Amino acid sequence: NNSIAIPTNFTISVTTEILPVSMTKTSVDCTMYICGDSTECSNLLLQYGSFCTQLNRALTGIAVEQDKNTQEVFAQVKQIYKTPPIKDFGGFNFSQIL
Amino acid sequence: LQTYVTQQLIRAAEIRASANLAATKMSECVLGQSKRVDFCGKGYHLMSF
Amino acid sequence: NGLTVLPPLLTDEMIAQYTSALLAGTITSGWTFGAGAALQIPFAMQMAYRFNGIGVTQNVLYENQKLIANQFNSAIGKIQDSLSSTASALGKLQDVVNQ
Amino acid sequence: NNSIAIPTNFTISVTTEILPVSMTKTSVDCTMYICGDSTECSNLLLQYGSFCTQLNRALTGIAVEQDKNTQEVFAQVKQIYKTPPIKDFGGFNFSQILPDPSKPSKRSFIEDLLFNKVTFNGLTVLPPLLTDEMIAQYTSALLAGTITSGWTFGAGAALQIPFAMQMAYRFNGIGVTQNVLYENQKLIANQFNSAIGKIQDSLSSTASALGKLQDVVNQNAQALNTLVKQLSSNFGAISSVLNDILSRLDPPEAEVQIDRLITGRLQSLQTYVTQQLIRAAEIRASANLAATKMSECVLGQSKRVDFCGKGYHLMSFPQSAPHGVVFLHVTYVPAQEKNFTTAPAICHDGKAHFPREGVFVSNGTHWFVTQRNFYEPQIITTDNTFVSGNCDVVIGIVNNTVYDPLQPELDS
Amino acid sequence: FVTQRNFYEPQIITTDNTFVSGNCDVVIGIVNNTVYDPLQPELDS
Amino acid sequence: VLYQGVNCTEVNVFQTRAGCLIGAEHVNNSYECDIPIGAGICASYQTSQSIIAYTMSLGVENSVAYS
Numbered sequence: 001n002n003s004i005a006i007p008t009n010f011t012i013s014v015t016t017e018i019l020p021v022s023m024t025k026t027s028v029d030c031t032m033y034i035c036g037d038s039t040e041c042s043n044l045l046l047q048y049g050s051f052c053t054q055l056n057r058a059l060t061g062i063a064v065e066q067d068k069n070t071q072e073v074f075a076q077v078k079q080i081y082k083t084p085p086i087k088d089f090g091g092f093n094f095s096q097i098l
Numbered sequence: 099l100q101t102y103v104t105q106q107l108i109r110a111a112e113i114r115a116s117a118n119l120a121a122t123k124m125s126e127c128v129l130g131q132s133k134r135v136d137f138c139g140k141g142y143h144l145m146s147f
Numbered sequence: 148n149g150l151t152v153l154p155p156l157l158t159d160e161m162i163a164q165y166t167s168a169l170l171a172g173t174i175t176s177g178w179t180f181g182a183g184a185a186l187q188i189p190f191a192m193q194m195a196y197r198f199n200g201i202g203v204t205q206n207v208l209y210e211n212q213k214l215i216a217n218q219f220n221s222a223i224g225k226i227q228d229s230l231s232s233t234a235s236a237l238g239k240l241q242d243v244v245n246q
Numbered sequence: 247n248n249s250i251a252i253p254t255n256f257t258i259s260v261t262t263e264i265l266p267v268s269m270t271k272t273s274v275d276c277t278m279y280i281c282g283d284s285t286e287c288s289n290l291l292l293q294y295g296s297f298c299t300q301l302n303r304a305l306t307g308i309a310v311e312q313d314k315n316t317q318e319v320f321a322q323v324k325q326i327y328k329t330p331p332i333k334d335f336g337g338f339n340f341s342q343i344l345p346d347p348s349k350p351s352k353r354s355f356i357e358d359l360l361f362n363k364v365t366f367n368g369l370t371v372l373p374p375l376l377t378d379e380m381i382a383q384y385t386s387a388l389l390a391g392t393i394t395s396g397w398t399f400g401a402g403a404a405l406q407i408p409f410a411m412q413m414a415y416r417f418n419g420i421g422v423t424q425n426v427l428y429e430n431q432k433l434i435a436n437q438f439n440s441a442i443g444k445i446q447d448s449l450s451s452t453a454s455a456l457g458k459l460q461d462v463v464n465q466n467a468q469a470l471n472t473l474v475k476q477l478s479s480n481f482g483a484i485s486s487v488l489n490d491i492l493s494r495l496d497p498p499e500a501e502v503q504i505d506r507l508i509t510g511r512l513q514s515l516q517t518y519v520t521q522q523l524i525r526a527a528e529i530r531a532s533a534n535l536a537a538t539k540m541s542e543c544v545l546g547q548s549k550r551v552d553f554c555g556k557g558y559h560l561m562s563f564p565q566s567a568p569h570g571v572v573f574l575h576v577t578y579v580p581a582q583e584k585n586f587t588t589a590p591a592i593c594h595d596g597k598a599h600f601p602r603e604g605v606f607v608s609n610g611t612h613w614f615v616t617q618r619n620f621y622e623p624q625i626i627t628t629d630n631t632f633v634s635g636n637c638d639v640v641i642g643i644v645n646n647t648v649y650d651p652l653q654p655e656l657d658s
Numbered sequence: 659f660v661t662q663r664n665f666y667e668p669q670i671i672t673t674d675n676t677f678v679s680g681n682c683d684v685v686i687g688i689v690n691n692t693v694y695d696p697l698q699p700e701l702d703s
Numbered sequence: 704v705l706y707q708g709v710n711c712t713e714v715n716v717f718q719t720r721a722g723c724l725i726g727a728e729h730v731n732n733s734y735e736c737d738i739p740i741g742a743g744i745c746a747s748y749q750t751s752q753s754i755i756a757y758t759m760s761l762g763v764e765n766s767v768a769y770s
């Protein structure tokens with residue numbers, strides 16, 4: 001009820017954290033995966049109706065979103081700021097990361 | 099093909115959650131200074147690159 | 148087999164331009180480029196403001212600046228050596244390719 | 247290493263952020279969809295078991311979740327707060343976003359712009375639990391609490407406070423000393439009133455601004471139109487129509503044709519329900535984000551840089567919209583900087599002085615301390631600063647002479 | 659009086675509870691009132 | 704019983720915006736959402752007893768004493 005510990009010193013620490021942002025943009029022609037070349041089979045696939053369009057639409061929605069994710073993460077900056085030619089950063093060295 | 103596209107919709111929704119988290123860390127940890135404990139690695143947060 | 152991979156809209160060079168811009172803003176201008184134009188501020192003062200943001204008084208930076216610079220430079224050195232030494236750190240990205 | 251740019255002026259800004267909150271609640275009679283109530287197909291569909299029942303259970307989970315989302319977003323307030331007869335909020339407008347009495351449903355003017363710009367084969371649509379009129383009372387309550395009582399209605403009962411003092415608070419929350427508001431109140435009220443005025447023109451200019459809400463309306467119509475069009479599909483059967491097959495063929499042959507229509511229609515219905523479960527997860531992620539911005543941006547003030555409109559955040563106003571919510575985020579943006587010489591600390595007599603708050607600057611001829619986010623120079627003094635050790639350890643310290651305001655009184 | 663904003667605790671208004679910024683002309687709704695000086699007891703020592 | 708999306712012509716009896724509602728009693732006075740129905744209607748077993756249905760009250764109304 002009368003003891004406290006206080007730090008008399010510090011460390012600056014650097015902690016790496018890693019996050020994924022985009023899948024590989026992938027798309028499939030449902031007629032070319034299901035049938036492939038055969039006009040006979042391509043005509044038979046029409047009996048199943050909208051699935052050919054609906055599945056290529058869903059992959060297009062995913063594929064378009066990967067460009068959106070990448071802009072939502074990195075394109076937060078209005079201008080391309082340039083690092084100055086002379087590194088008077090009070091001793092802090094950023095060469096490895098510039 | 100329906101199985102693949104269904105699983106890619108769910109995986110893409112998980113990557114969207116990660117991309118929104120990355121955009122949040124970009125907004126708070128780089129462009130600012132977080133006062134949210136252990137959102138920016140262990141210790142009190144100073145900045146991030 | 149009717150499968151295709153499309154290119155990203157931003158190339159890896161364009162991502163390197165944006166991470167360069169975010170980083171050069173963060174080094175020269177603190178948080179201010181997240182509101183206004185990038186207001187220049189000397190980097191030792193930007194760290195004094197960031198120390199003041201964790202309840203440590205500004206003088207604790209300037210009275211230890213040369214020590215703090217060596218701790219930061221050494222810490223970046225350990226990141227560069229760690230990432231150079233082992234691929235095992237990048238699991239969160241390699242898993243997304245593998246899946 | 248000795249240059250700092252300090253903003254001498256600023257702009258209040260109003261940023262409109264739009265979020266989806268709920269889908270059109272939908273439930274499908276899978277027997278009326280697949281079989282058209284024609285009994286010979288229902289007596290086959292019974293043999294598939296739980297694929298009848300569990301799709302209504304899954305869509306009921308989605309339908310209830312739309313009410314849960316809309317409850318968590320708007321019903322954060324403990325009481326229905328309503329604005330006094332007087333509207334003297336220090337000059338700040340508050341009319342185009344408060345309720346309009348001429349509007350039948352008591353929506354605001356900007357809520358009416360949003361409600362204008364956004365636009366049964368066994369399928370059924372279910373009403374929301376809260377009507378557009380009830381949501382418009384919650385967005386009025388959150389707004390009337392926010393205008394009359396600051397963040398206090400988010401902590402307990404609403405405590406009244408004059409609106410100029412609530413803004414003086416919210417400036418004091420972004421590292422601007424509150425005198426900067428009072429000395430500029432008419433200018434700040436005009437920048438804010440003008441910035442609201444531009445929202446009405448902005449929302450009038452194009453429907454493409456509401457893309458996030460027009461998308462959740464379009465995708466549910468597009469899904470159901472495709473689900474209806476899939477009735478017109480053969481899946482290998484002689485005809486797309488059930489009662490046609492039952493007229494053409496003896497029960498043995500008819501059964502094989504009908505079992506294809508059952509399989510095809512059911513696979514189309516499972517595809518639709520699976521897509522709606524995934525779309526509902528995306529809308530829930532947006533509804534939790536909106537429920538967070540009500541708590542942090544409306545009921546509070548947020549330190550989270552670029553969570554609550556660009557610039558430093560002051561406050562926000564929610565406005566309702568079809569299938570969603572719109573925040574008018576009010577933000578301080580610094581806007582007219584000048585370059586100044588600066589030093590990390592100054593020397594007095596053998597002592598390093600550091601600024602208590604703010605930063606040292608010089609116009610080139612005199613040394614001053616200024617607050618960090620607005621140029622306002624004060625003569626450097628023993629109360630504005632604190633000492634910490636001798637005149638050496640610091641890198642780039644300058645020589646000066648600090649005034650000590652007690653010494654002229656010690657002339658007594 | 660002046661108080662902390664989240665609990666009623668009245669402090670006598672003084673030059674260390676408060677800070678100056680210019681004249682009254684621009685401040686809408688300012689009132690008058692003494693501000694006490696904590697040096698006064700030893701200004702009259 | 705609620706007949707979702709029906710007009711009572713097609714079926715105490717009460718027409719709601721959600722549908723022709725049967726066996727409940729309409730009450731004008733407003734209360735908490737005890738059982739949800741739709742389009743602002745809710746139902747409860749408030750007392751001498753029957754199920755009632757009423758337009759829900761969103762909360763106690765309060766004009767904040769601002770000047």
Ligand SMILES: *[C@@H]1O[C@H](CO)[C@@H](O)[C@H](O)[C@H]1NC(C)=O
Pocket residue numbers: 008009010011218
């Ligand atoms: C504080 O720790 C650092 C190593 O992190 C060391 O170099 C320095 O001498 C220490 N200072 C004190 C006060 O012990």
Ligand SMILES: *[C@@H]1O[C@H](CO)[C@@H](O)[C@H](O)[C@H]1NC(C)=O
Pocket residue numbers: 087091092093094095096
């Ligand atoms: C920064 O690091 C690089 C690589 O080790 C080195 O060449 C350079 O001299 C360093 N600069 C400073 C300021 O220490």
Ligand SMILES: *[C@@H]1O[C@H](CO)[C@@H](O)[C@H](O)[C@H]1NC(C)=O
Pocket residue numbers: 255256257433437
């Ligand atoms: C600051 O900027 C506003 C416009 O945003 C302008 O009207 C005003 O004259 C400027 N200067 C002052 C007096 O702050």
Ligand SMILES: *[C@@H]1O[C@H](CO)[C@@H](O)[C@H](O)[C@H]1NC(C)=O
Pocket residue numbers: 333334337338339340341342
């Ligand atoms: C807000 O501005 C509008 C501009 O048309 C005006 O009609 C209205 O009276 C103003 N309200 C207040 C109370 O400032």
Ligand SMILES: *[C@@H]1O[C@H](CO)[C@@H](O)[C@H](O)[C@H]1NC(C)=O
Pocket residue numbers: 251583584585
């Ligand atoms: C500050 O310095 C830069 C570079 O010399 C110059 O472009 C700018 O006009 C100066 N003034 C401002 C806006 O701070």
Ligand SMILES: *[C@@H]1O[C@H](CO)[C@@H](O)[C@H](O)[C@H]1NC(C)=O
Pocket residue numbers: 088247248641642
């Ligand atoms: C800034 O760097 C230059 C390098 O030539 C040096 O001469 C100057 O003294 C430095 N000023 C400060 C404030 O450290």
Ligand SMILES: *[C@@H]1O[C@H](CO)[C@@H](O)[C@H](O)[C@H]1NC(C)=O
Pocket residue numbers: 593643644645
């Ligand atoms: C300040 O003055 C002292 C002598 O009193 C001198 O030794 C020192 O170098 C001066 N420093 C600067 C920044 O001019």
Ligand SMILES: *[C@@H]1O[C@H](CO)[C@@H](O)[C@H](O)[C@H]1NC(C)=O
Pocket residue numbers: 334686687
């Ligand atoms: C408040 O408004 C009333 C009526 O306009 C006015 O008489 C009074 O002086 C105002 N007080 C302040 C603090 O502005």
Ligand SMILES: *[C@@H]1O[C@H](CO)[C@@H](O)[C@H](O)[C@H]1NC(C)=O
Pocket residue numbers: 688689690
């Ligand atoms: C304060 O007193 C002065 C006269 O010394 C008078 O002109 C002014 O109107 C008074 N202000 C108030 C708000 O009482």
Ligand SMILES: *[C@@H]1O[C@H](CO)[C@@H](O)[C@H](O)[C@H]1NC(C)=O
Pocket residue numbers: 709710711712718
């Ligand atoms: C229901 O039918 C009646 C028949 O008189 C009609 O007046 C009414 O408008 C219809 N609509 C509803 C849902 O009440």
Ligand SMILES: *[C@@H]1O[C@H](CO)[C@@H](O)[C@H](O)[C@H]1NC(C)=O
Pocket residue numbers: 729730731732
């Ligand atoms: C509700 O109000 C109407 C007004 O015409 C009245 O006829 C009806 O009896 C009232 N019902 C109840 C339960 O008070």
